[PDB]
């Protein structure tokens, strides 16, 4: 009875949160599988998740619960355990289970920035021209919904390990902050990141990019493409081939969000566009605005 009234006030808060803006996003470091004994503000409305999942957070319900959703099509808002609640549940398990011898959430941009790597190194013609055609395509295809921005700062330095002049490190931080700001209103964000040739270069940052691997499957083809750009590029063959082989050595499922191994620009573009449309849907659930009826019933 005190409890049915509390559930009502909780449900109502959830209702109102459907159409609020996303306050921030997290990437999870742990898994959470909801149980009845977690004492969810509305029973059955907890958001379960696996490690490495993304959540959009609307608001703080209390010290134990936030309100938000999994970034996935079909998923609607519910209650997400706060770090305090996750730690309390962890200790409940440890207490039930029982001299000299890990945050559950990282804050990430609300839209994961897209970053292109491959087919070889940036600053050489084959990779620069191939990527330029993809960026030109994105600009036209997602007009009104996208921000594409160059990043010349070395954003691989954006880890606590680092957090080089004082001025350069402040510039890296200001670029991170800019990229978070570009994503705040849920536009797609595409970075032309001069210094990033390999996904491991961003894996320790809080950017949580969408890594797009522009992959030339055959090294023989790559070599001949470099040669097509003349002796001035071909004299740099080795460094370009080594870089392409490092990409090919990565565990693909864990390293790349999208792999463009199509040999036709049209097909590579439509694959990337299909991916990004799907990501648009995941991040923009229809529930985030109510229709405003044209006609009233009476």
């Amino acid at each position: 009875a005190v409890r049915r009234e509390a559930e009502r006030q909780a449900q109502a808060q959830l209702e109102k949160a459907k159409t609020k803006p996303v306050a921030f996003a997290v990437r999870t470091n742990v898994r959470y599988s909801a149980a009845q004994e977690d004492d969810v503000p509305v029973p059955g409305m907890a958001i379960s998740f696996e490690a490495k999942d993304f959540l959009h957070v609307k608001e703080k319900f209390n010290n134990d619960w936030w309100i938000g959703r999994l970034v996935k099509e079909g998923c609607e808002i519910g209650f997400i355990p706060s770090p305090v609640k996750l730690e309390n549940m962890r200790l409940q398990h440890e207490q039930r289970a029982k001299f000299f011898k890990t945050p559950p959430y990282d804050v990430v941009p609300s839209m994961r920035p897209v970053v292109l790597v491959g087919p070889s190194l940036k600053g050489y013609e084959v990779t620069d021209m191939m990527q330029k055609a993809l960026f030109d395509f994105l600009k036209h295809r997602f007009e009104g919904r996208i921000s594409i921005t160059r990043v010349t700062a070395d954003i691989s330095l954006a880890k606590r390990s680092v957090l080089n002049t004082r001025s350069s490190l402040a510039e890296v931080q200001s670029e991170i902050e800019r990229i978070f700001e570009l994503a705040r209103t849920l536009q797609l964000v595409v970075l032309d990141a001069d210094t990033i040739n390999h996904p491991a270069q961003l894996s320790k940052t809080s950017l949580a990019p969408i890594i797009v691997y522009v992959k030339i499957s055959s090294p023989k083809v790559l070599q001949r493409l470099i040669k097509s750009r003349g002796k001035s590029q071909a004299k740099h063959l080795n460094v370009q081939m080594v870089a392409a082989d490092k990409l090919a050595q990565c565990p693909p499922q864990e390293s790349f969000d999208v792999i463009l191994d199509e040999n036709q620009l049209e097909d590579a573009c439509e694959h990337l566009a299909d991916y990004l449309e799907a990501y648009w849907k995941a991040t923009h659930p229809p529930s985030s605005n109510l229709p405003n009826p044209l006609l009233s019933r009476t």
Partner: peptide, 19 residues
């Protein structure tokens, strides 16, 4: 053309579209 020649042509065409 062989798959490798087809790959190569597709990529060379892709590069021309960047200019």
């Amino acid at each position: 053309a062989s798959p490798l020649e087809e790959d190569l042509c597709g990529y060379l065409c892709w590069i021309t579209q960047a200019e």
